[PDB]
Design a protein around this ligand. Sequence first.
Ligand SMILES: [Zn+2]
Ligand SMILES: [Zn+2]
Ligand SMILES: [Zn+2]
Ligand SMILES: [Zn+2]
Ligand SMILES: [Zn+2]
Ligand SMILES: [Zn+2]
Ligand SMILES: [Zn+2]
Ligand SMILES: [Zn+2]
Length: 200
Amino acid sequence: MRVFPVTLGPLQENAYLVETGEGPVLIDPGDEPEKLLALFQTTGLIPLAILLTHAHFDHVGAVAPLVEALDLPVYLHPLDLPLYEGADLAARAWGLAIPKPPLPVRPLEEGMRLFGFQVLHLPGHSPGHVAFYDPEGAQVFSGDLLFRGSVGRYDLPGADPKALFASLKRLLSLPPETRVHPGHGPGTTLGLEARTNPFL
Ligand SMILES: [Zn+2]
Ligand SMILES: [Zn+2]
Ligand SMILES: [Zn+2]
Ligand SMILES: [Zn+2]
Ligand SMILES: [Zn+2]
Ligand SMILES: [Zn+2]
Ligand SMILES: [Zn+2]
Ligand SMILES: [Zn+2]
């Protein structure tokens, strides 16, 4: 896999354009569709699908224009559908404008394999929060579960603090060399966080 991260929107969310053995995918296009469209150009990669770790508005704000332009299927765990459906309203409450994310979506599920990833259902930050795990490349796109020196907020819509810490226990049982590509902030590894994260 070749991995192209881009930070997007006022909430500084990380999208990932990833070349897989089954073609390119785009993970969490949160905002600034022009910036994503420009990334397609400089990399020469056109995503075949949108994959969503979860449906907080900062992760889905660029879904609509990209689906309109490229007819991209959108993969989301069904437990985050209520978040997905009202994402523009949630953004609006903070005074932020995004287009309403388009329906329908294609489902994700614990144990599913797609585009070279294994889907881990890891709720807590949101009910349908997943990670996309690539054991062969030793890497995980774990959304807002685990950050460099912190963990996902558990005070947001759909949050479940006890689910979160159970999910983190699950995540930290993967190989320590596993590279983490999170929804916010810099990349890390599971081993580094095992040594330094104050929540672990
Ligand atoms: Zn790779
Ligand atoms: Zn925007
Ligand atoms: Zn989130
Ligand atoms: Zn179309
Ligand atoms: Zn496949
Ligand atoms: Zn589950
Ligand atoms: Zn619960
Ligand atoms: Zn986020």
